[PDB]
């Protein structure tokens, strides 16, 4: 606690059976952790996208920790993720509160030195009209 830093900008979204990677790191070795820790628990047909930067003007967190973060959030269609400066902001459709509050254990066992906004909801939303 009592603490704040200035670290990278990055993001990524999930659209059921694709997921899409957008920012910025010191490395691609950073990008490579972060599609890693997703990979873990990939599922066969599940499609990735990337739009992810380098440059070492900027700095941040390893997701090599944050492999059972996506694991908690496999069932999750709408899931996302978000970092900036000294905060980690993670946002989804759970199947159950339980999956709501494991979310938040993983992302305080893998950030127990930042900012943890657990954004997560339980699903409650499926109205009439598909697409096509």
């Not at 990524?12 to 890693?36: C, H, Y």
């Not at 066992?109 to 699903?123: A, H, L, Q, R």
Request: charged fraction near 15%; avoid cysteine; proline fraction near 9%.
């Amino acid at each position: 606690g009592a603490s704040a830093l200035s670290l990278s900008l990055l993001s990524i979204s999930r659209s059921g059976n694709t997921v899409t990677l957008i920012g910025d790191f010191p490395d691609e070795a950073a990008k490579a952790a972060l599609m890693t820790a997703l990979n873990g628990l990939l599922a066969p047909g599940v499609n990735v996208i990337d739009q992810i930067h380098v440059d070492p003007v900027v700095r941040s967190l390893d997701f090599s920790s944050a492999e059972p973060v996506f694991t908690a959030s496999v069932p999750i269609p709408d899931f996302g993720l978000k970092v900036e400066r000294d905060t980690v902001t993670l946002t989804g459709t759970a199947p159950s509160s339980e999956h709501k509050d494991a979310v938040k254990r993983a992302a305080t066992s893998t950030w127990p030195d930042m900012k943890i906004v657990n954004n997560i909801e339980v699903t409650g939303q499926a109205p009439p009209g598909p697409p096509a």
